[PDB]
Amino acid sequence: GDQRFGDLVFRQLAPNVWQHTSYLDMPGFGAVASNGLIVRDGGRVLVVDTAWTDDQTAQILNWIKQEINLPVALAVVTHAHQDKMGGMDALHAAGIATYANALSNQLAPQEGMVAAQHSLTFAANGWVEPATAPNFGPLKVFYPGPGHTSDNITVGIDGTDIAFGGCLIKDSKAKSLGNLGDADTEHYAASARAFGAAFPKASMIVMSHSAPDSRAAITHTARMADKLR
Ligand SMILES: COc1ccc2c(CP(=O)(O)O)cc(=O)oc2c1
Ligand SMILES: [Zn+2]
Ligand SMILES: [Zn+2]
Structure with missing residues (x-):
């Protein structure tokens, strides 16, 4: 199931969807896994x-080139943390168009990140403005509202049972909400519930630091964020 490719791990979740996993030593926490997604949409990859x-x-x-061999049309990044x-510069070096919440791009320099090239903005109900x-x-x-960070965004994959x-979001057996240094403790619980309501069909919940x-x-995540209130 888990394909090891150099120091990264790739796991197929659906016919056109894979999870990518990379690791960074956090001095004081061990080597922390972080997950993202790769989606084939016809003749391109997102x-x-x-x-x-x-x-x-x-x-x-490099894994996409070997295992899918189609151009990467765009990347969207879900908040301004490492x-x-x-890896924004690597996407730009490869010529890939990049997207983030406008707030993520605003925060990127102070967080030590490189901004994405394009800014997403959101309607009052939370859905991305499609023109962006x-x-x-x-x-x-x-x-979904401020939670893990004020700029965090989420992504569902139409045609699948997957939401990211x-x-x-933490797994159902998680014991803490992790890094709350930039968190909105007051609104976290509501934001977690708004994510679930936005994607009611999604039965496979993918997240940054645990398996789907x-x-x-x-x-479970919402119940724990209640204790920060
Ligand atoms: C589990 O130990 C961690 C994991 C991640 C972080 C990060 C990245 P994020 O998960 O918050 O996006 C920022 C930090 O300051 O400490 C961390 C500690
Ligand atoms: Zn973060
Ligand atoms: Zn995280």
């Missing part, structure tokens, strides 16, 4: 999140 580093992200592109945007996410194919981008919560889980990950 990426959700970089790896932690440029070198790892270039390796994602696990999700650390052109040619996204099956990717349905939703801002990024660092907002059932919808119990959403309910």
Whole structure:
């Protein structure tokens, strides 16, 4: 199931969807896995999140070349932390168009990240304004409210049972909400529930630091964010 490709791991989740996993030593936490997605949409590939580093992200592109062999049309990154945007330069070096929440691009320099080339904006109900996410194919981008960070966004894959919560969602057996340094403790619980409501059909919940889980990950995450209130 898990394909090891250099220092990264790739796992097929659906006929056109794979999870990419990369690792970074956090002095004091061990080697932390971070997950993103790779989606084939016809004759092109779409990426959700970089790896932690440029070198790892270039390796994602190398895996895509070997295992899919179609151009990567775009990447969308789900907030301005290293696990999700650390490899932006590698995407730009490869000529890939990049997208992030406008707020993520605003925060990127102070977070030590390189901004994406394009900014997503969101309607009052949280759905991306479609003019800012052109040619996204099956990717349905939703801002659930501030939680893990103020800029965190989420992505469902139309035609599959998969929704990606990024660092907002933890697995159903998780014991903590992880890094709350940039979190909105007041609104976290509501934002987690809004993600679940935006993607009611999704039975496979993919997230940044755990293997894919059932919808119990959403309910469990929300119950824990209640304790920050
Ligand atoms: C589990 O230990 C971690 C994992 C990730 C982080 C990150 C990246 P994120 O997961 O918050 O996006 C930022 C940080 O300051 O410490 C961390 C500690
Ligand atoms: Zn984060
Ligand atoms: Zn994280």
